[PDB]
Design a protein around this ligand. Structure first.
Ligand SMILES: COC(=O)C1CCN(C(=O)NC(C)(C)C)CC1
Length: 119
């Protein structure tokens, strides 16, 4: 990550862009596994092996409350969604596949956001 991602405080204008990025991911066809916290009745061992769970509804709550102070912190929570999924599930599972697709989409949208901050 470059300097302004790490170092620049998020302004109110930045927050309007973060809301747009988040809603784009929530609307993606492959986002279904990640919209809400993992249901323990689906996977009784999940919360014993994943130390720091994350999901898009938790990120929405955090955006609304202005939890994030730097872009790096927002990127770190999003990356945790995908890394948790690739650690828990095998590489041939549809869950793992969805993480691959949605992370690529996030990177496209994140590049767009970064370009819009400065010029
Ligand atoms: C992002 O979601 C996940 O990583 C969980 C979601 C719940 N899940 C399953 O329903 N898989 C079983 C039934 C085969 C255990 C495990 C993976």
């Amino acid at each position: 990550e470059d300097a302004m991602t790490v170092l620049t405080p998020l302004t109110e204008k930045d927050y309007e862009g973060l809301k747009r990025v988040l809603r784009s991911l929530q609307a993606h066809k492959m986002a279904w596994p990640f919209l809400e916290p993992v249901d323990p009745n689906d996977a009784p061992d999940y919360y014993g092996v994943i130390k720091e769970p994350m999901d898009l509804a938790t990120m929405e709550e955090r955006v609304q409350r202005r939890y994030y102070e730097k872009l790096t912190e927002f990127v770190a929570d999003m990356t945790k969604i995908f890394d948790n999924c690739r650690y828990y599930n095998p590489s041939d599972s549809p869950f793992y596949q969805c993480a691959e697709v949605l992370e690529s989409f996030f990177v496209q949208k994140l590049k767009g956001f970064k370009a819009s901050r400065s010029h």
